Amino acid sequence: PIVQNLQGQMVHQAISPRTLNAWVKVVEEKAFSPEVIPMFSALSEGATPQDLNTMLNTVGGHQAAMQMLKETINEEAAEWDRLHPVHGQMREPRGSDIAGTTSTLQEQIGWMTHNPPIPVGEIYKRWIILGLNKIVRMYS
Ligand SMILES: CCc1cc(-c2ccc(C)o2)n(-c2ccc3c(c2)nc(-c2cc(C(=O)O)ccc2O)n3Cc2ccc(=O)[nH]c2)n1
Ligand SMILES: O=C(O)c1ccc(-c2ccc3c(c2)nc(-c2cn[nH]c2-c2cccc(Cl)c2)n3CCCn2ccnc2)cc1
């Protein structure tokens, strides 16, 4: 995630094992429950798209759930491209860039800290939450 240090600068730091552990814990302890969703938000504060993918991959053995998530992400990325088509320079992010599949961590941090910013982590996070809601329904 990207966090503000003591001075006031925005610095990147890795996800802790503790955080990844708590995430796997909640996904399984509360499997199928929407209770998982606010915990996802809590555990992913300041997350970049790469971070979100690390979290998803740690629970990536769930075949049907991951497939539902993937198709949701694909749909949202397509809608992003419709809503915001791409026309010290910096290229603008496309749907696949927000999902972290075609962008580097450097590029993601660049967008998030740009003036003015595009919070690609927060955007991707919403797509994932859409997916999580659909997983709840698929297993209701
Ligand atoms: C928002 C709530 C949520 C989000 C995710 C979630 C997972 C990954 C991501 C990104 O999100 N899950 C979730 C958690 C555990 C799961 C799961 C989905 N799907 C299975 C599963 C079911 C069957 C199947 O039912 O055929 C066969 C194989 C399976 O991997 N398990 C395992 C399981 C299965 C039964 C049980 O009682 N407990 C746990 N729930
Ligand atoms: O759903 C959300 O939460 C959500 C949705 C959309 C946005 C969003 C999308 C595109 C945005 C934006 C903000 N701000 C700008 C914007 C406005 N001026 N410069 C930029 C910019 C240019 C290059 C890289 C980056 Cl990082 C920003 N653009 C680029 C617009 C096109 N452009 C290109 C140059 N000047 C303007 C933010 C949040």
Coordinates of N, CA and C and ligand atoms in Angstrom, one line a residue:
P1 N 0.8 -1.2 0.0 CA 0.0 0.0 0.0 C 0.8 1.3 0.0
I2 N 0.2 2.4 -0.3 CA 0.9 3.7 -0.3 C 0.4 4.4 1.0
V3 N 1.4 4.8 1.8 CA 1.1 5.5 3.1 C 1.9 6.7 3.3
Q4 N 1.3 7.7 4.0 CA 2.1 8.9 4.3 C 2.9 8.7 5.5
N5 N 4.2 9.0 5.4 CA 5.2 8.8 6.5 C 5.1 9.9 7.5
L6 N 6.1 10.1 8.3 CA 6.2 11.1 9.4 C 6.3 12.5 8.8
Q7 N 7.1 12.7 7.7 CA 7.3 14.0 7.1 C 6.1 14.5 6.4
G8 N 5.4 13.6 5.6 CA 4.3 14.0 4.8 C 4.3 13.5 3.4
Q9 N 5.4 12.7 3.1 CA 5.6 12.2 1.8 C 4.8 10.9 1.6
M10 N 4.4 10.6 0.4 CA 3.7 9.3 0.1 C 4.7 8.2 -0.2
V11 N 4.7 7.2 0.6 CA 5.7 6.1 0.4 C 5.0 4.8 0.2
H12 N 5.6 3.9 -0.6 CA 5.1 2.6 -0.8 C 5.7 1.6 0.3
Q13 N 4.8 0.7 0.7 CA 5.3 -0.4 1.6 C 4.6 -1.7 1.3
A14 N 5.2 -2.8 1.6 CA 4.6 -4.1 1.3 C 3.5 -4.5 2.2
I15 N 2.6 -5.4 1.8 CA 1.6 -6.0 2.6 C 2.3 -6.9 3.6
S16 N 2.0 -6.8 4.9 CA 2.6 -7.7 5.9 C 2.0 -9.1 5.8
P17 N 2.8 -10.1 6.2 CA 2.2 -11.4 6.4 C 1.0 -11.5 7.2
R18 N 1.0 -10.6 8.3 CA -0.2 -10.6 9.2 C -1.4 -10.2 8.5
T19 N -1.3 -9.2 7.6 CA -2.5 -8.8 6.8 C -3.0 -9.8 5.9
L20 N -2.1 -10.5 5.2 CA -2.5 -11.5 4.3 C -3.1 -12.7 5.0
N21 N -2.6 -13.0 6.2 CA -3.1 -14.0 7.1 C -4.5 -13.8 7.6
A22 N -4.8 -12.5 8.0 CA -6.1 -12.1 8.4 C -7.1 -12.2 7.3
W23 N -6.6 -11.9 6.1 CA -7.5 -11.9 4.9 C -7.9 -13.3 4.5
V24 N -7.0 -14.3 4.5 CA -7.3 -15.7 4.3 C -8.3 -16.1 5.4
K25 N -8.0 -15.7 6.6 CA -8.8 -16.1 7.8 C -10.2 -15.7 7.6
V26 N -10.5 -14.5 7.2 CA -11.9 -14.0 7.1 C -12.6 -14.6 5.9
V27 N -11.9 -14.7 4.8 CA -12.5 -15.3 3.6 C -13.0 -16.8 3.9
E28 N -12.3 -17.5 4.7 CA -12.7 -18.9 5.0 C -13.6 -19.0 6.3
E29 N -13.3 -18.2 7.3 CA -14.1 -18.3 8.5 C -15.5 -17.8 8.2
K30 N -15.6 -16.8 7.4 CA -16.9 -16.2 7.0 C -17.2 -16.5 5.5
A31 N -16.8 -17.6 5.1 CA -17.0 -18.0 3.7 C -18.4 -17.8 3.3
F32 N -18.6 -17.1 2.1 CA -20.0 -16.9 1.5 C -20.7 -15.8 2.2
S33 N -20.2 -15.2 3.3 CA -20.9 -14.2 4.0 C -20.5 -12.8 3.5
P34 N -21.4 -11.8 3.4 CA -21.1 -10.5 3.1 C -20.2 -9.8 4.1
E35 N -20.1 -10.4 5.3 CA -19.3 -9.9 6.4 C -17.8 -9.8 5.9
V36 N -17.5 -10.6 4.9 CA -16.1 -10.6 4.3 C -15.8 -9.2 3.7
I37 N -16.8 -8.5 3.2 CA -16.6 -7.3 2.4 C -16.1 -6.1 3.2
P38 N -16.7 -5.8 4.3 CA -16.1 -4.7 5.1 C -14.7 -5.0 5.6
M39 N -14.4 -6.3 5.8 CA -13.1 -6.7 6.2 C -12.1 -6.6 5.1
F40 N -12.5 -6.9 3.9 CA -11.7 -6.6 2.7 C -11.3 -5.1 2.6
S41 N -12.2 -4.3 2.8 CA -11.9 -2.8 2.8 C -11.0 -2.4 3.9
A42 N -11.2 -2.9 5.1 CA -10.3 -2.6 6.2 C -8.9 -3.1 6.0
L43 N -8.7 -4.3 5.4 CA -7.4 -4.9 5.2 C -6.6 -4.3 4.0
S44 N -7.3 -3.6 3.2 CA -6.8 -3.1 1.9 C -6.6 -1.6 1.9
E45 N -6.5 -0.9 3.0 CA -6.3 0.5 3.1 C -5.0 0.9 2.3
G46 N -5.2 1.9 1.4 CA -4.1 2.4 0.6 C -3.5 1.5 -0.4
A47 N -4.2 0.4 -0.7 CA -3.8 -0.6 -1.6 C -3.6 -0.1 -3.1
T48 N -2.5 -0.5 -3.7 CA -2.4 -0.4 -5.2 C -3.1 -1.5 -5.8
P49 N -3.3 -1.5 -7.2 CA -3.8 -2.6 -7.9 C -3.0 -3.9 -7.7
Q50 N -1.7 -3.8 -7.7 CA -0.8 -4.9 -7.4 C -1.1 -5.6 -6.1
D51 N -1.3 -4.7 -5.0 CA -1.6 -5.2 -3.7 C -2.9 -6.0 -3.7
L52 N -3.9 -5.4 -4.4 CA -5.2 -6.1 -4.4 C -5.1 -7.5 -5.1
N53 N -4.2 -7.5 -6.1 CA -4.0 -8.8 -6.8 C -3.2 -9.8 -5.9
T54 N -2.3 -9.3 -5.1 CA -1.6 -10.2 -4.1 C -2.7 -10.8 -3.2
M55 N -3.6 -10.0 -2.7 CA -4.7 -10.4 -1.8 C -5.6 -11.5 -2.5
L56 N -6.0 -11.2 -3.7 CA -6.9 -12.1 -4.4 C -6.1 -13.4 -4.7
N57 N -4.9 -13.3 -5.1 CA -4.1 -14.5 -5.4 C -3.9 -15.4 -4.2
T58 N -3.9 -14.8 -3.0 CA -3.7 -15.6 -1.8 C -5.0 -16.5 -1.6
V59 N -6.1 -16.1 -2.1 CA -7.3 -16.9 -2.0 C -7.7 -17.4 -3.4
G60 N -6.8 -17.5 -4.3 CA -7.0 -17.8 -5.7 C -7.4 -19.3 -6.1
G61 N -7.4 -20.1 -5.1 CA -7.6 -21.5 -5.3 C -9.1 -21.9 -5.4
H62 N -9.9 -20.8 -5.2 CA -11.4 -21.0 -5.2 C -11.9 -20.8 -6.7
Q63 N -12.1 -21.9 -7.4 CA -12.2 -21.8 -8.8 C -13.5 -21.0 -9.3
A64 N -14.6 -21.4 -8.8 CA -15.9 -20.7 -9.2 C -15.9 -19.3 -8.8
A65 N -15.5 -19.0 -7.6 CA -15.5 -17.6 -7.1 C -14.6 -16.8 -7.9
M66 N -13.4 -17.3 -8.2 CA -12.4 -16.5 -8.9 C -12.9 -16.2 -10.3
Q67 N -13.6 -17.2 -10.9 CA -14.1 -17.0 -12.3 C -15.2 -15.9 -12.3
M68 N -16.1 -15.9 -11.3 CA -17.1 -14.9 -11.1 C -16.4 -13.5 -11.0
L69 N -15.4 -13.5 -10.1 CA -14.6 -12.3 -9.9 C -14.0 -11.8 -11.3
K70 N -13.4 -12.7 -12.0 CA -12.7 -12.3 -13.2 C -13.7 -11.8 -14.3
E71 N -14.8 -12.4 -14.4 CA -15.8 -11.9 -15.4 C -16.4 -10.5 -15.0
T72 N -16.5 -10.3 -13.7 CA -16.9 -9.0 -13.2 C -15.9 -7.9 -13.5
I73 N -14.6 -8.2 -13.2 CA -13.5 -7.3 -13.4 C -13.5 -7.0 -14.9
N74 N -13.6 -8.0 -15.8 CA -13.6 -7.8 -17.2 C -14.7 -6.8 -17.7
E75 N -15.8 -7.0 -17.1 CA -17.0 -6.1 -17.4 C -16.7 -4.7 -17.0
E76 N -16.2 -4.5 -15.8 CA -16.0 -3.2 -15.2 C -14.8 -2.5 -16.0
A77 N -13.8 -3.2 -16.4 CA -12.7 -2.7 -17.1 C -13.2 -2.2 -18.5
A78 N -14.1 -2.9 -19.1 CA -14.7 -2.5 -20.4 C -15.5 -1.2 -20.2
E79 N -16.3 -1.1 -19.1 CA -17.1 0.1 -18.8 C -16.1 1.2 -18.6
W80 N -15.0 1.0 -17.9 CA -14.0 2.1 -17.7 C -13.6 2.6 -19.0
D81 N -13.3 1.7 -19.9 CA -12.8 2.2 -21.2 C -13.8 3.0 -22.0
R82 N -15.1 2.7 -21.8 CA -16.2 3.4 -22.4 C -16.3 4.8 -21.8
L83 N -16.2 4.8 -20.5 CA -16.4 6.1 -19.7 C -15.2 7.0 -19.8
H84 N -14.0 6.5 -19.9 CA -12.8 7.3 -19.9 C -11.8 6.8 -20.9
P85 N -12.2 6.9 -22.2 CA -11.3 6.5 -23.3 C -10.0 7.2 -23.3
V86 N -8.9 6.4 -23.6 CA -7.6 7.0 -23.6 C -7.3 7.7 -25.0
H87 N -6.9 9.0 -24.9 CA -6.7 9.7 -26.1 C -5.2 9.7 -26.5
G88 N 8.4 14.4 -18.7 CA 7.6 14.2 -17.5 C 6.1 13.9 -17.9
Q89 N 5.9 13.4 -19.1 CA 4.6 13.0 -19.5 C 4.2 11.7 -18.9
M90 N 2.9 11.5 -18.8 CA 2.3 10.3 -18.3 C 1.1 9.8 -19.0
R91 N 1.1 8.5 -19.5 CA 0.0 7.9 -20.2 C -1.2 7.7 -19.2
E92 N -2.4 7.8 -19.7 CA -3.6 7.6 -18.9 C -3.9 6.1 -18.8
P93 N -4.5 5.7 -17.7 CA -4.8 4.2 -17.5 C -6.0 3.7 -18.2
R94 N -5.9 2.6 -18.8 CA -7.1 1.9 -19.3 C -7.6 0.9 -18.3
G95 N -8.7 0.2 -18.7 CA -9.3 -0.8 -17.8 C -8.3 -1.8 -17.3
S96 N -7.6 -2.4 -18.2 CA -6.6 -3.4 -17.8 C -5.5 -2.9 -16.9
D97 N -5.2 -1.6 -17.1 CA -4.2 -0.9 -16.2 C -4.7 -0.8 -14.8
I98 N -5.9 -0.5 -14.6 CA -6.5 -0.4 -13.3 C -6.6 -1.7 -12.6
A99 N -6.8 -2.8 -13.4 CA -6.9 -4.1 -12.8 C -5.5 -4.7 -12.6
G100 N -4.5 -3.9 -13.0 CA -3.1 -4.3 -12.7 C -2.5 -5.3 -13.7
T101 N -3.2 -5.7 -14.7 CA -2.7 -6.8 -15.6 C -1.8 -6.2 -16.7
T102 N -2.0 -4.9 -17.1 CA -1.1 -4.4 -18.1 C -0.3 -3.2 -17.6
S103 N -0.3 -2.9 -16.3 CA 0.4 -1.8 -15.7 C 1.5 -2.3 -14.8
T104 N 2.5 -1.5 -14.6 CA 3.5 -1.8 -13.6 C 3.1 -1.2 -12.2
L105 N 3.8 -1.6 -11.1 CA 3.6 -1.0 -9.9 C 4.0 0.5 -9.9
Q106 N 5.1 0.7 -10.6 CA 5.6 2.1 -10.8 C 4.5 3.0 -11.4
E107 N 3.8 2.5 -12.5 CA 2.8 3.2 -13.2 C 1.6 3.5 -12.3
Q108 N 1.3 2.5 -11.5 CA 0.1 2.6 -10.6 C 0.4 3.6 -9.5
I109 N 1.6 3.6 -8.9 CA 1.9 4.6 -8.0 C 1.9 6.0 -8.6
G110 N 2.4 6.0 -9.8 CA 2.4 7.3 -10.6 C 1.1 7.9 -10.8
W111 N 0.1 7.1 -11.1 CA -1.3 7.6 -11.3 C -1.9 8.0 -9.9
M112 N -1.7 7.2 -8.9 CA -2.2 7.5 -7.6 C -1.6 8.8 -7.0
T113 N -0.4 9.1 -7.3 CA 0.2 10.3 -6.7 C 0.4 11.5 -7.7
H114 N -0.3 11.3 -8.9 CA -0.2 12.3 -9.9 C -1.0 13.6 -9.5
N115 N -0.6 14.7 -10.0 CA -1.4 15.9 -9.8 C -2.0 16.4 -11.1
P116 N -3.4 16.2 -11.3 CA -4.3 15.6 -10.3 C -4.3 14.1 -10.4
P117 N -4.7 13.4 -9.3 CA -4.6 11.9 -9.2 C -5.7 11.1 -9.9
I118 N -5.4 9.9 -10.3 CA -6.4 8.9 -10.6 C -6.2 7.7 -9.6
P119 N -7.1 7.6 -8.6 CA -6.9 6.6 -7.6 C -7.2 5.1 -8.1
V120 N -6.3 4.6 -8.9 CA -6.5 3.3 -9.5 C -6.8 2.2 -8.5
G121 N -6.1 2.3 -7.4 CA -6.4 1.3 -6.3 C -7.8 1.3 -5.8
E122 N -8.3 2.5 -5.6 CA -9.7 2.6 -5.1 C -10.7 2.2 -6.1
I123 N -10.4 2.5 -7.4 CA -11.3 2.1 -8.5 C -11.3 0.6 -8.6
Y124 N -10.2 0.0 -8.7 CA -10.1 -1.5 -8.8 C -10.8 -2.1 -7.6
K125 N -10.6 -1.5 -6.5 CA -11.2 -2.0 -5.2 C -12.8 -2.1 -5.4
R126 N -13.4 -1.1 -6.0 CA -14.8 -1.2 -6.2 C -15.2 -2.3 -7.1
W127 N -14.5 -2.6 -8.2 CA -14.8 -3.7 -9.1 C -14.7 -5.0 -8.3
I128 N -13.7 -5.1 -7.5 CA -13.5 -6.4 -6.7 C -14.7 -6.5 -5.7
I129 N -15.1 -5.5 -5.0 CA -16.3 -5.5 -4.2 C -17.5 -5.9 -4.9
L130 N -17.7 -5.4 -6.1 CA -18.8 -5.9 -7.0 C -18.8 -7.4 -7.1
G131 N -17.6 -7.9 -7.4 CA -17.3 -9.3 -7.6 C -17.6 -10.1 -6.3
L132 N -17.2 -9.5 -5.2 CA -17.5 -10.2 -3.9 C -19.0 -10.3 -3.6
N133 N -19.7 -9.2 -3.9 CA -21.2 -9.3 -3.7 C -21.8 -10.4 -4.6
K134 N -21.3 -10.5 -5.8 CA -21.8 -11.6 -6.7 C -21.5 -13.0 -6.2
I135 N -20.3 -13.1 -5.5 CA -19.9 -14.4 -4.9 C -20.9 -14.7 -3.8
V136 N -21.2 -13.8 -3.0 CA -22.2 -13.9 -1.9 C -23.5 -14.5 -2.5
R137 N -24.0 -13.9 -3.6 CA -25.2 -14.3 -4.2 C -25.1 -15.7 -4.8
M138 N -24.0 -16.0 -5.5 CA -23.8 -17.3 -6.1 C -23.8 -18.4 -5.1
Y139 N -23.5 -18.1 -3.9 CA -23.4 -19.1 -2.8 C -24.4 -18.9 -1.7
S140 N -25.5 -18.1 -2.0 CA -26.5 -17.9 -1.1 C -27.4 -19.2 -0.9
Ligands
LIG1 C1 -17.7 -12.4 0.0 C2 -17.7 -13.9 0.5 C3 -16.7 -14.7 -0.1 C4 -15.7 -14.4 -1.0 C5 -15.0 -15.5 -1.3 C6 -13.9 -15.7 -2.1 C7 -13.1 -16.7 -2.5 C8 -12.1 -16.2 -3.4 C9 -12.4 -14.9 -3.5 C10 -11.8 -13.8 -4.3 O1 -13.4 -14.5 -2.8 N1 -15.7 -16.5 -0.7 C11 -15.5 -17.9 -0.7 C12 -14.9 -18.5 0.4 C13 -14.6 -19.9 0.5 C14 -15.0 -20.7 -0.6 C15 -15.6 -20.1 -1.7 C16 -15.9 -18.7 -1.8 N2 -15.9 -21.0 -2.7 C17 -15.5 -22.2 -2.2 C18 -15.7 -23.5 -2.9 C19 -16.9 -24.0 -3.0 C20 -17.1 -25.3 -3.7 C21 -18.5 -25.8 -3.8 O2 -19.4 -25.4 -3.0 O3 -18.7 -26.7 -4.7 C22 -16.0 -26.0 -4.2 C23 -14.7 -25.4 -4.0 C24 -14.5 -24.2 -3.4 O4 -13.3 -23.7 -3.3 N3 -15.0 -22.0 -0.9 C25 -14.4 -23.0 0.0 C26 -15.4 -23.5 1.0 C27 -16.4 -24.5 0.6 C28 -17.3 -24.9 1.4 C29 -17.4 -24.3 2.8 O5 -18.2 -24.7 3.6 N4 -16.4 -23.4 3.1 C30 -15.5 -23.0 2.2 N5 -16.8 -16.1 0.1
LIG2 O1 -14.4 6.5 -10.3 C1 -13.5 7.2 -9.8 O2 -13.2 7.1 -8.6 C2 -12.7 8.0 -10.7 C3 -13.0 8.1 -12.1 C4 -12.2 8.8 -12.9 C5 -11.1 9.6 -12.5 C6 -10.3 10.4 -13.4 C7 -10.1 9.9 -14.7 C8 -9.3 10.5 -15.6 C9 -8.7 11.7 -15.2 C10 -8.8 12.2 -13.9 C11 -9.6 11.5 -13.0 N1 -8.0 13.4 -13.8 C12 -7.4 13.5 -15.0 C13 -6.5 14.7 -15.3 C14 -6.9 16.0 -15.4 N2 -5.8 16.7 -15.7 N3 -4.7 16.0 -15.8 C15 -5.1 14.7 -15.6 C16 -4.2 13.5 -15.6 C17 -3.4 13.2 -16.8 C18 -2.5 12.2 -16.8 C19 -2.4 11.3 -15.8 C20 -3.2 11.5 -14.6 CL1 -3.1 10.4 -13.3 C21 -4.1 12.6 -14.5 N4 -7.8 12.5 -15.9 C22 -7.4 12.4 -17.3 C23 -8.4 13.1 -18.1 C24 -7.9 13.4 -19.5 N5 -6.8 14.3 -19.5 C25 -5.5 14.1 -20.0 C26 -4.8 15.3 -19.7 N6 -5.6 16.2 -19.1 C27 -6.8 15.6 -18.9 C28 -10.8 9.5 -11.1 C29 -11.6 8.7 -10.2

